[PDB]
């Protein structure tokens, strides 16, 4: 329900030009309800999200590229 409410709020923000203030709505974990996180003072550096996305995408691409494994038995 919480994720559905977040998605509904963000969909309203994206499709309604006059409701663009809903972009800041995040999760209020103490009460379990959506909350304006920009007004609540919940901030993160943009570089954190950007680098997380880039590194995660590269790692997923690297692992996904594999389709066969050869595991040589140890010589010892």
């Amino acid at each position: 329900d919480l994720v559905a409410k977040l998605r509904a709020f963000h969909n309203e923000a994206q499709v309604n030009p006059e409701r663009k203030n809903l972009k800041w709505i995040g999760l209020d974990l103490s009460n379990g309800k959506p909350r304006d996180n920009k007004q609540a003072g919940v901030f993160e550096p943009t570089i954190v999200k950007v680098k997380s996305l880039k590194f995660a995408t590269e790692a997923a691409i690297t692992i996904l590229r594999i389709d066969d494994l050869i595991k040589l038995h140890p010589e010892s």
Partner: peptide, 8 residues
């Protein structure tokens, strides 16, 4: 970065 280690 120093943060977001679990998230990535």
């Amino acid at each position: 970065v120093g943060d977001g280690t679990t998230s990535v």
